[PDB]
RNA sequence: GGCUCAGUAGGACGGCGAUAAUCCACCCGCAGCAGAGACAAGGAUAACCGCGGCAAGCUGCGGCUAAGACAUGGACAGGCUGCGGCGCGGGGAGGCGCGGGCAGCGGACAGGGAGCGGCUGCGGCGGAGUUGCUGGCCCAUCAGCUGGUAGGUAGGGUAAGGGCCUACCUAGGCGACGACGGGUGACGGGGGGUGAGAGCCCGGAACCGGAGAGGGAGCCUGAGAAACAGCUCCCACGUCCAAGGACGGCAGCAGGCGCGGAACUUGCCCAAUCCCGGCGGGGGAGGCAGCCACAAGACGUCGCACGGCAAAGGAGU
């Protein structure tokens, strides 16, 4: 199971359990708030912060279970051809528990720079578009 | 090999040139080892010696501790003895010698512990002054019993005159004083003192006020 | 390279203290003091570009050793004392007292106040917080503190404090409509009437100001310095008064409209 | 004929810098102090700064008030120039680095360094 | 600072950020600094006085003696850690700051009759470490690459986030939108050249950043170095020795040799520009002059006085 006994931080200020608004705008989905994951890398339930540049990406892969693969796909203009070129980077990003099953391939994804969370993981999953929607 | 003698009780110090069958009598022997005047020759039958130091045909140093008689190269730090370290922080690799008297040492430093029978002219018969006077004032008012009340500096030179032999010219040593109650240490701590609780008050002032102005119910 | 610098290039140094190319390979490197090297020009500066009181080094060590010049009503006997903005020089021989501003052509100038002008500064805080033990001590942008002071006073707004007596004892916040000169940037040196504050949750409020002629422009509120509320202004104005003139009103008065 | 451009007084200095421009068609100091009442030590000139085709040369003078402020305030080169002090030696910057890279090498006072030196250069 | 551009194809650089993941010297602004016998502080050591060793480089023995050195004395606070925990402020976002708790630690003036100087904390400043996004050469006769590799949990370690490391566990990660590998007689940039322009080419070279000090590696001290006109060792070259040992790193300034097509005086000086030092000092940084048709610009076909200069010389009469 768990190596350790699983707790979360203590809940300054459903009151047993502890969540935070991560600011910029945005909302804590109601899967963090009546969960009962105890993911530490997590936004919400967890001790990362978001700060930087959050941008929008879409899911490459959503293999191996927290982290998923999001690509940023972008134009960069050739000046002397006077055309573009389609480029993208592809980012290992932290897909949190409360968005397990809401974000699947394809969804258009915000990310939000965190800390160095893995060796390439600077980002976590804030929010999430369905690509039906 | 010369054997450097000194007498800590006396001051003095002398080279004493022993011949080649004495310096095997002292190999083997380690730093810190006392040896015994008969060991070195009839002249010093009586003394006790005790090994401090030697020295190298080479020119090293001795280092105490290291428990051979060969050279060896070692790494000091500044206040390790063979090395005179310059700037801080600085280690280098000496070479010394260990403890261990051989035939390569061409000098060997000890002091007299206890005087023997008969007196060595350069080592027993004269007395070599202590080099300076403690500047402290403790230090200084148990050397001379000096009052508590007088002036230290004013009470040696009342004494040298005292006991001077109708001397028309009198230099005095080297008196200067230091760690003594003075009149501006007393002042220093007193406004000290002063000021620390003239902060307690003006500090407690001005939150007295800062409670009046901007909260003025409470 | 990789340290803290000694020196400084002369190319390297502001353009705001006007040193010229040829004048040598280094320029003053400031001491590390109240202001940041970016809003700051040294004492050395001052005495002899602008004041010309020392043309040498040897001269200028004289007028430092003899502790005529004071900054702020302290003496600072150091030559690459960094005064920066608002900040007031005060020297008894000659009894001159100015306060370092800006000009419209983006350089510092000394301008001439009263003795009575003198007698206080403006500051613009940087930060709040409560110190060990509950006392509210803010902190100013030039690096002063002061403890006690108005809970009204919050982040971005400039206090008259008492330069003979460490207390502050005017307040000036940042709203609408407050007079403000502009610290840094294209605008360096003008001062106008603040008609907007955007927020920019996250980074950087942006102020909208216009002149006393009517130009608007765009600024940071990191840029902004107010320098009065609607009905007066707490300090005197330099030559020029902040209008930055444009290029063909510049043009128009040489050649008639 | 001379004529002052301008009339500054530096009060910290105690001294007036003026700039004259002197002209002569076709012993400076001299008329200077014929202007102002002022003694000939009192007068320290910076520079002679001359167009090319006018005979119309610029002198930037200093007026000082005392002699002992002259000579602390000003370089000690144009109190060499006036009177020719040399007070401070300073023998030659060739011999003075030598002199000081080899008191840098001595450890202790020289005495005792020079002491040891002839008692091994006697043996 | 100066020099240099070997390495570096992203550990760089540039632009935009982040450090709520971090540390700190000078300096500046604030708060503060233990009543302890306290009108008071303990043992040392260098210098020095002698005696020496040793070719030299370097070093020993003895004797005394200082402090703003090193201690003792003495804990109101800050601080650290665990647990508890409401609020008040700030911030986009919090136990970030502060007040209120229980414990376990721990911890700031015994200085001076030329200005003061120590130490603790908060805030700067001055730095610094990490770091995100992004852009920038060639080769596909380099098409698949990857095993600490990609992730998770947990601990360690660090000033600090992190496979950074370890333990266990997932099977990932990147790629024709060119990965990976190779090449480069590649430091990057601000920029420069050339063209009407689109472009092409160059950037050693003033300023900024990086990197290096014969090749390396390791470290001490310190706020800051993996420092090199510091140390330790190895390697390759080179030097001195009385043969036991001792040394050298001019990609600092001149100068020499070598290399080549290819590049100056073993000059003078801190006067200017500035830096270190708490001031009198030091500075081959730097300036001045000399050498060179190397370049830009202007102009033709011999000696006093003056002038300036740190000094001299030149410009100018
Ligand atoms: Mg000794
Ligand atoms: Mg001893
Ligand atoms: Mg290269
Ligand atoms: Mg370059
Ligand atoms: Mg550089």
């Known amino acids: 199971k768990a190596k350790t006994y699983p707790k979360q931080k203590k809940p300054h200020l459903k009151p047993e359990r502890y969540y935070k608004n991560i600011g910029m705008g945005y909302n804590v989905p109601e899967t963090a708030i009546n969960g009962t994951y105890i993911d530490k890398k997590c936004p919400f339930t967890g001790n990362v912060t978001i700060r930087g540049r959050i941008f929008k990406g879409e899911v490459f892969k959503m293999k191996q279970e927290k982290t998923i693969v999001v690509v940023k796909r972008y134009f960069h203009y050739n000046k002397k051809y006077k055309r573009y070129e389609r480029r993208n980077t592809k980012f290992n990003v932290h897909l949190s528990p409360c968005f397990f099953g809401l974000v699947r391939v394809g969804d258009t994804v915000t990310c939000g720079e965190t800390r160095a969370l893995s060796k390439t993981k600077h980002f976590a999953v804030i929010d999430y578009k369905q690509k039906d929607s | 090999m010369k054997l450097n003698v000194a007498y800590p009780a006396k001051g003095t110090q002398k080279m004493i040139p022993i011949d080649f069958q004495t310096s095997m009598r002292l190999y083997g022997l380690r730093l810190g080892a006392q040896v015994e005047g008969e060991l070195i020759g009839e002249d010093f039958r009586g003394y006790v010696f005790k090994i401090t130091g030697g020295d190298d045909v080479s020119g090293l140093p001795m280092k105490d501790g290291v428990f051979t008689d060969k050279r060896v190269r070692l790494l000091l730090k500044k206040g390790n003895k063979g090395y005179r370290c310059r700037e801080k922080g600085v280690r280098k690799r000496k070479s010394v010698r260990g403890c261990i008297i051989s035939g390569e040492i061409a000098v060997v430093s000890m002091i007299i512990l206890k005087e023997g029978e008969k007196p060595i002219e350069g080592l027993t018969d004269r007395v070599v002054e202590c080099s300076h006077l403690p500047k402290r004032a403790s230090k200084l008012r148990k050397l001379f019993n000096i009052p508590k009340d007088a002036n230290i500096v004013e009470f040696i030179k009342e004494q040298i005159r005292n006991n001077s032999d109708s001397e028309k010219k009198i230099r005095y040593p080297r008196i200067k004083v230091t760690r003594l109650i003075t009149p501006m240490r007393i002042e220093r701590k007193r406004k000290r003192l002063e000021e620390k609780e003239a902060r307690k008050i003006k500090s407690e002032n001005e939150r007295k006020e800062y409670m009046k102005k901007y909260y003025p119910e409470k | ?257 | 004929e001379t004529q002052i451009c301008m009339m500054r007084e530096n009060r910290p200095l105690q001294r007036r810098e003026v700039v004259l421009s002197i002209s002569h068609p076709k012993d400076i100091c001299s008329q200077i102090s014929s202007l102002f009442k002022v003694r000939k030590e009192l007068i320290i000139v910076s520079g002679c700064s001359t167009r090319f085709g006018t005979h119309q040369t610029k002198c930037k003078v200093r007026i000082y008030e005392s002699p002992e402020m002259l000579r602390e305030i000003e370089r000690d080169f144009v109190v060499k120039r006036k009177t020719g002090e040399e007070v401070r030696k300073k023998k030659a910057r060739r011999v003075r680095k030598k002199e000081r890279k080899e008191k840098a090498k001595i450890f202790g006072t020289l005495r005792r360094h020079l002491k040891k030196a002839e008692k091994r250069a006697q043996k």
């Not at chain 3, 020009?41 to 043309?55: D, S």
């Not at chain 3, 033990?133 to 404090?161: A, E, H, L, M």
Request: glycine residues 8%; aromatic residues 8%.
């Open chain 3, 1 to 257: 390279t990789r340290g803290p610098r000694r020196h400084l290039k002369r190319l390297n140094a502001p353009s705001s203290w006007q040193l010229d190319k040829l004048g040598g390979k280094y320029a003053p490197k400031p001491s590390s003091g109240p202001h940041r090297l970016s809003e700051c020009i040294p004492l050395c500066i001052l005495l002899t570009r602008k004041l010309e009181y020392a043309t040498t080094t040897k001269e200028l060590k004289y007028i430092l050793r003899k502790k005529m010049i004071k900054v702020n009503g302290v003496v600072r006997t150091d030559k690459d004392f960094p005064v920066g903005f608002m900040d007031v020089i005060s020297i008894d021989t000659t009894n001159e007292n100015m306060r370092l501003l800006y000009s419209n052509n983006r350089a510092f100038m000394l301008h001439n106040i009263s003795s009575e002008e003198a007698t206080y500064r403006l500051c613009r805080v940087s930060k709040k917080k409560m110190g060990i033990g509950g006392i509210p001590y803010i902190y100013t942008q030039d690096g002063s503190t002061f403890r006690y002071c108005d809970p009204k006073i919050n982040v971005n707004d400039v206090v008259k404090v008492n330069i003979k007596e460490k207390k502050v004892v005017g307040f000036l916040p940042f709203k609408s409509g407050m007079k403000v000169f502009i610290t840094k940037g294209k605008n360096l040196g003008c001062i106008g009437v603040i008609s907007g504050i955007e927020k920019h949750m996250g980074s950087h409020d942006i102020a909208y100001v216009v002149d006393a002629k009517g130009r608007s422009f765009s600024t940071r509120t990191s840029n902004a310095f107010i320098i009065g509320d609607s009905e007066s202004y707490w300090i005197s104005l330099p030559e020029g008064e902040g209008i930055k003139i444009s290029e063909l009103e510049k043009s128009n008065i040489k050649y008639g409209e």
